Design a protein around this ligand. Structure first.
Ligand code: APC
Ligand code: MN
Length: 478
C-alpha cells in the first residue's frame, strides 16, 4: 500500500545514520570512537558468566522477538500482499524447554498470543497444535486439518511433510469420519482442538480424496490438494537450496519464496524481491538490529560480534544493498591441510546430480563424513536416490564418485593425487527414507524439530551408524 511503500522508502537510506541511531539506543543503556574502541566461542567465557545459577550483566531476554520478529512478519505479510492477490496452513513446531530456543521462544511468548490476527497470523492449524511438545502428533494434526483445509521455517522439513502423507493417507480418511483425532495423539491441546476441527463426519471429501491420492504419479501432487495457494514460504537459500528441485516435482512449480534471513544471535534482514528465483534470492538487512555498519565485494547484547556466516552482495537499488547467502563457515571437512566447505560440497553434488540425471535417477538428500580410522583418510558421502538387489547401475555413481573429486579444490587434489594423504572418494548408498529416519534421531536427541536443517558434515558420531546401518552399496573413485 501507500504506507508500506512509504516505510520501505524510509528504510532508505539506512546505511549509516539510522543504524547509528539504533546503535545509540543500543549503547546508551561518536561512532568513530566506538569503531576505534569496540564470536560465541570467544564470548563463551563471557556469556556463561550470567548462567552461574538457576533455581547478570543485562536482562534476558528482551532482545530479538520482542522488537524484531513481529515487525518482520508484518512487513513481509504486506510485501506478499503487494506482490500477490487473493491471499487476503504453515508448519511450525515447539518442544519442551528459561533458555533461548529456536523460533519456539516466539511461540512461548505473548507477542505470539497478542499477535494481530487478520490473515497472515491466521492458520488452519489450532494454536494448541503448534506449541504441542509432541511434534509427531502435531504434524499429523497439521496434515489432517490440511486434508480438511479446503510453508515452514526451513525447507528440509517440507519434504518430510510431504513424506509422511506418502506413507499415510487413509488414516486421515478414517479420522475425518470418526470426528476424533487419532488415538495415538497424546496432547491435550492437539486432541481437544483437532477433535473440535474434525467435528461432524465428512465422507464427501473422503471419497474424492481417496480417488485423488491413489494416482500412480507423484508429480505435482501437493499443488492439487490446495490449488488456491499462490506461493511457498521457506528458505531456499543456503544449504536448503538442496531441496529446491524436489519440490517442483511434488508441486506445480509454484514459486519458492524465502522471506527472511536471521541467526540465533539476531535477525538480519528480509528479501525485498519475491520475483527472485531461488538462486538469485537476496536478503537486504534491517538498520534497527544492525551492527558492524555498512558500505561488489566479498565480506542489543552483542557489539561488533562476528556472525559466523558468509554472504555476498547481489546488487542494490542504490538506496540499500542486496545480499544472497552462499556458505557457512562452521561446517568444514578436512584431513591434512585441506579445508572443504559448504559451497565446495554443493559444487561437487551439483556436478554429481547431473551424472545421475542422465542415468534415469535423481538425488533425494546427501550428507558427508570423513574417515580418519584408516590411512589414507578418505572423503565419504552418503546419497539417497529416487527413481521417480533392485535396480543398481554400477557405472553411474562410480562416475559420480570421481566427478565430485575434480570439482573440489586442488588443495584436496594435492593430498589426493600425487601426494597420497587422502584416498579415493567413497559414496555410500542408503536405502529409502534413511534421511527421514535420521532426522527423527536428532529431534529425539534434543534438536529442534522443526528448526531442522540437514547438516552436511557429521561429527556426532552417534548418528553415523544410522547411515551405516542403511547402506545398500559403496562406490569408489580412481
Ligand atoms: N536463510 C538462510 N540461509 C542460509 N543459512 C541460514 C539461513 N538462516 C539461518 N542460517 C544459518 O543457520 C544458523 C541458524 O541456526 P543454526 O544453523 O542451528 C546455527 P549453527 O551454528 O549452524 O548450528 P551448529 O553450531 O549447532 O552447527 C545461523 O547461524 C545462520 O548462519
Ligand atoms: Mn550453519
Amino acid at each position: 500500500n501507500e504506507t508500506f511503500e512509504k516505510q520501505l522508502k524510509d528504510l532508505t537510506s539506512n546505511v549509516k545514520s539510522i543504524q547509528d541511531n539504533l546503535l545509540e539506543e543500543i549503547i546508551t543503556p561518536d561512532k568513530e570512537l566506538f569503531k576505534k574502541n569496540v564470536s560465541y566461542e570467544d564470548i563463551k567465557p563471557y556469556l556463561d558468566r550470567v548462567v552461574n545459577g538457576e533455581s547478570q550483566k543485562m536482562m534476558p531476554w528482551n532482545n530479538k522477538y520482542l522488537d524484531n520478529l513481529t515487525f518482520i512478519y508484518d512487513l513481509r505479510m504486506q510485501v506478499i500482499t503487494k506482490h500477490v492477490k487473493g491471499v487476503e496452513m504453515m508448519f511450525l513446531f515447539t518442544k519442551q524447554e528459561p533458555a533461548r530456543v529456536a523460533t519456539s521462544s516466539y511461540f512461548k511468548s505473548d507477542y505470539f498470543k497478542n499477535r494481530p490476527s487478520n490473515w497472515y497470523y491466521s492458520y488452519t492449524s489450532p494454536d494448541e497444535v503448534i506449541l504441542c511438545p509432541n511434534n509427531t502428533e502435531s504434524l499429523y494434526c497439521h496434515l489432517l486439518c490440511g486434508l480438511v483445509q479446503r510453508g515452514s521455517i526451513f525447507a528440509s522439513v517440507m519434504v518430510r511433510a510431504i513424506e509422511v502423507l506418502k506413507n499415510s493417507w487413509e488414516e486421515l480418511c478414517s479420522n475425518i469420519r470418526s470426528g476424533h483425532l487419532s488415538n495415538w495423539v497424546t496432547d491435550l491441546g492437539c486432541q481437544n482442538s483437532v477433535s473440535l476441527v474434525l467435528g461432524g463426519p465428512r465422507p464427501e471429501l473422503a471419497d474424492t480424496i481417496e480417488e485423488i491420492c491413489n494416482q500412480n504419479s507423484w508429480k505435482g501432487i501437493v499443488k492439487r490438494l490446495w490449488p488456491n495457494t499462490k506461493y511457498i514460504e521457506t528458505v531456499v537459500t543456503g544449504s536448503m537450496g538442496q531441496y529446491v528441485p524436489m519440490l517442483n516435482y511434488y508441486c506445480n512449480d509454484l514459486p519458492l519464496v524465502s522471506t527472511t534471513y536471521g541467526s540465533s544471535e539476531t535477525t538480519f534482514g528480509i528479501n525485498l524481491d519475491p520475483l527472485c528465483k531461488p538462486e538469485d534470492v537476496s536478503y537486504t538487512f534491517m538498520p534497527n538490529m544492525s551492527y558492524f555498519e555498512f558500505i561488489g565485494c566479498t565480506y542489543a547484547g552483542l557489539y561488533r560480534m562476528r556472525v559466523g556466516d558468509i554472504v555476498l552482495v547481489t546488487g542494490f537499488y542504490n538506496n540499500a544493498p542486496q545480499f544472497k547467502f552462499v556458505r557457512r563457515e562452521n561446517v568444514v571437512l578436512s584431513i591434512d591441510s585441506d579445508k572443504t566447505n559448504e559451497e565446495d560440497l554443493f559444487k561437487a553434488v551439483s556436478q554429481a546430480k547431473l551424472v545421475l540425471e542422465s542415468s534415469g535417477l535423481d538425488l533425494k538428500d546427501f550428507t558427508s563424513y570423513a574417515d580418519t580410522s584408516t590411512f589414507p583418510g578418505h572423503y565419504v558421502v552418503y546419497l539417497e536416490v529416487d527413481t521417480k538387489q533392485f535396480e543398481l547401475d554400477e557405472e553411474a555413481l562410480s562416475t559420480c564418485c570421481l566427478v565430485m573429486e575434480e570439482s573440489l579444490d586442488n588443495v584436496y587434489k594435492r593430498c589426493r593425487f600425487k601426494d597420497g594423504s587422502i584416498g579415493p572418494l567413497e559414496i555410500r548408498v542408503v536405502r529409502q527414507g534413511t534421511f527421514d529416519s535420521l532426522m527423527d534421531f536428532f529431534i529425539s536427541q534434543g534438536a529442534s524439530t522443526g528448526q531442522y536443517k540437514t547438516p552436511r558434515c557429521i561429527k556426532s558420531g552417534k548418528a553415523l551408524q544410522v547411515l551405516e546401518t542403511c547402506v545398500v552399496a559403496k562406490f569408489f573413485s580412481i
